[PDB]
Amino acid sequence: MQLRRYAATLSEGDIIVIPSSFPVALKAASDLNMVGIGVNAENNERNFLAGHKENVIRQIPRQVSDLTFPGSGEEVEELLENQKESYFVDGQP
Amino acid sequence: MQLRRYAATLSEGDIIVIPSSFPVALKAASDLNMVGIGVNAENNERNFLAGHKENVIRQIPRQVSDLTFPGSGEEVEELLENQKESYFVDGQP
Amino acid sequence: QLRRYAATLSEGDIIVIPSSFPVALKAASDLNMVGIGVNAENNERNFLAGHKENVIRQIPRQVSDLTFPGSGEEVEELLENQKESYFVDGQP
Amino acid sequence: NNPYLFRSNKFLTLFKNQHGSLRLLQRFNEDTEKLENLRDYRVLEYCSKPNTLLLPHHSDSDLLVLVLEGQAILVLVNPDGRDTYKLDQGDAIKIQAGTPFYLINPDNNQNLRILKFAITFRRPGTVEDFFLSSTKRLPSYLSAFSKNFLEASYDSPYDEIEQTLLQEEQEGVIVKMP
Amino acid sequence: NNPYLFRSNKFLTLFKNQHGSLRLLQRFNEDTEKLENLRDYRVLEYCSKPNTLLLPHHSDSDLLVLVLEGQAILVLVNPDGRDTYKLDQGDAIKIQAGTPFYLINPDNNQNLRILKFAITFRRPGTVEDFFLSSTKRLPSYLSAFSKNFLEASYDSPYDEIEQTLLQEEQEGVIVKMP
Amino acid sequence: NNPYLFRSNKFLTLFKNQHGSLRLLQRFNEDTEKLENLRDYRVLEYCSKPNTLLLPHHSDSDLLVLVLEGQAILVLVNPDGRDTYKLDQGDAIKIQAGTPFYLINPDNNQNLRILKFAITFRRPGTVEDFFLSSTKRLPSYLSAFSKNFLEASYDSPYDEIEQTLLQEEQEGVIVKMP
Amino acid sequence: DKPFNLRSRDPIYSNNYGKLYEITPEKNSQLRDLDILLNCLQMNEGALFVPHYNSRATVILVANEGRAEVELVGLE
Amino acid sequence: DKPFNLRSRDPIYSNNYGKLYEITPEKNSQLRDLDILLNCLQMNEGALFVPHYNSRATVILVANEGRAEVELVGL
Amino acid sequence: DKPFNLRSRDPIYSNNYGKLYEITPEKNSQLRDLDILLNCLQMNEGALFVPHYNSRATVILVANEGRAEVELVGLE
């Protein structure tokens, strides 16, 4: 297996398909409005990887985080605390 | 992407498959008895194109009938009124 | 065409048993197996030998007599020999 | 060319006999990709003469049995007992896969014509029947088991098992009621 | 290469006209086996100018209609009567397969953009539309019937049926409201 | 030839380590069209030595986890908090797709053997695992995002994110509890 | 589950030209499990079953008695 | 069944950077028959919708207004 | 949903030769969502599980401990 990234800038009318379990992220290059249609929708739950609320990484106990990440439990924990916003954030460089 | 007609005379024991949304009509060449088995049956509704009752074309408002048909709204309306029977009619030439 | 699929399974080996296919297995040693059945809802197990839940035993004498080379009574007795059910002594 | 039409000739004959016949319709998606949605269904037709019996067997598929002409006796066998049904022209009933059963035409002058709509799920578009009786066409599936398995199972000497229920008896699967 | 990306160019145009257009996106599993779970769905986009009408027709698939921009009048025809709905930007509604319907852009300045998510079941991945009106692109499906069948059905001389509803009238399926 | 038989050798080894292994059985319909009805299922086997941990990861499929031998600690991570389960030989539990989870063999002398029955739906017959940790076999999926996206998201300088959670730490996905 | 007759209920369409009996999965438990619909069609010689179409069900028609001239319109 | 608007219910995520409206099959009968979910996304220029993934749903995203830089990670 | 054991309920078949534990989707919510059925089979050396067949379920049997001689009859 080989991890891969699919990046692309979408214009009005363009479509992107996002498979379940695939991590995704997107930035509004201009004021953005999108419509999504999800299939196999029943019981879908959204898991976040960054931000403050609903961040699954934040739920991993320090002992194990320490073992799964190169940094230390405390270090990992702090890093996940810097971002105060949730879901949508300021994507400025 | 083209329109096509499938005509055939069926004898005892013969089978014809009628897909959903496909307009179909049949004339009894002799005293007829047929049995049908419909799949994907839940919520099936039969729409008629001729006859008096359950004729979907008769439900189109005159303003729009006039635009969808070569004739005029009134003309179209009368034509759909000649057949007094429903579902089954006299198929004599 | 009728066909038999026999095989000896060792630890870690897997065999798939399709529905409606008659199956039987003998423990060559003390055996423990785990099974996972798909399309499980409403599954009913029918036995061909043994005393309990033997579908052949439910066939009336008149018709048994017509489906088997033997006679109704004969067939009936033969299905009465095995006193056990489900699992039996597989000794030769 | 009409891909939606299936004439009588397109019925493969599974078993003819002078007492009746059993025929199976080719797969609906055999000659066309226009009926993929009917790939899990098979059509069977059964016709038998007066005082005839279709030997007990189970199917690996669900069956929607429909009496097109005549009268019939249907017996469904359960490991617990059995259910008998008297079917009249126009009657229909579902037979769940794996249920052994036998059909009888009790009438003495009128034939029996039945339509069998099979809903397959084990092997899509494929329907198999397991007959308990050994015939020319095919031997009883009980005979596919080894001698040791059978002897231990029925707890009886083999050659006795063979002559009581494994030996080729009937000519075909459709016989006549005495 | 990105198999999950579908640019506007990958939209086959089903029908362009100076009043509007109807486009269909290629099958999701066309260039890739990575989206087999989306094979039963097709995406369509519809765009029309002010005071336009999409002629009555029924689809063989379930449609999830979604107004992306503009305002619209949707009329669903039943064999019993009909239902009229006013759709605003952001409104959505399900149109059950086999339901004849027509779409209107009532506004006089703003265009109408509608996304149509189709859920196919008769022929997976395939969505068909049946237009009652004869046009250049295709003749009314009512005309595919024989003269005898039509005469008996409507109970009227053929040449009268022909010029009242079978004769090629409109240029396209998208016309303008008077 | 027996198409219904699958020996141990037919197990592709996904990851071996001196602490344990994870193996995946070939698709049931790989060598035969006789098992099309099992195409959506894959069987996996997991074995680990005393005091070992399978790093957190989420699967794209539904898992039915069954403890064949040994004892195990199962932690299911929710975005809200988490749930811990103590599994004994014979216990079974369902883990829904998308739920990150880790496994622990708390025993000090006995090994842990677990059978995983996967029910796929995103890509039929295909089961994928997403590991949060960077290893030799594969880097952390979080690393696939651009530097800008990561910095904005975590709101921290990149090289600090890199050394805290993206840097290749462990050897494999199965490590040993201190 | 017991046997049920196709003509056990009133026909949904009755004329001087023909009758149509129909049992849907909504009105019969055995049928709703299979998502199947069953119907019996009886027409007098010369009768015509006017042009119509089913919205969802694909029907497998069987000629039991008599001959029928069917015209099916499709879009390939 | 009548029409329903995507923004008819309160958003499930609301910020100074964006909003996400969502109607699931659990809250809408028309949708539960289709087992589909619909959502309307509105973001302010410069806003980033942080890395996340859906457990069971495969979402078809449509760009209606504006440009979006999306980063999808797969295996 | 919590963990459940295969031997949590009384076996459905118990002998001097063998036992069979079975949990069906009817008796376990987690399993009914998946439409799966689980079972544990324990037999003493020499014991024979008589010829039988499942009406609807396709079972994937796994050898956990010991050796087994299985005979499967099919029609192809």
Swiss-Prot record, chain C:
What the protein does comes down to: Seed storage protein.
Please give the family membership noted in the entry.
Answer: Belongs to the 7S seed storage protein family.
* Subunit structure comment from the entry: Homotrimer.
The scientific name of the source species is Canavalia ensiformis (Jack bean)
Q: List where the protein spans the membrane.
A: none
Name this polypeptide is given: Canavalin
From Swiss-Prot, chains D, E, F:
Intrachain disulfide bonds: none
Q: Which GO terms describe its molecular function?
A: identical protein binding; nutrient reservoir activity
List the record's Gene Ontology CC terms alphabetically.
protein-containing complex
User: Is Transit peptide one of the keywords UniProt gives this record?
Assistant: no
Keywords of this entry? Seed storage protein, Signal, Storage protein
Q: Which residues form the Cupin type-1 domain?
A: 4-162
Family designation: Belongs to the 7S seed storage protein family.
Self-association or partners: how does it assemble?
Homotrimer.
Q: What does this protein do?
A: Seed storage protein.
What is the name of this protein? Canavalin
**What species is given as this protein's source?**
Canavalia ensiformis (Jack bean)
**Residue span relative to the full protein:** 46 to 223 of 445
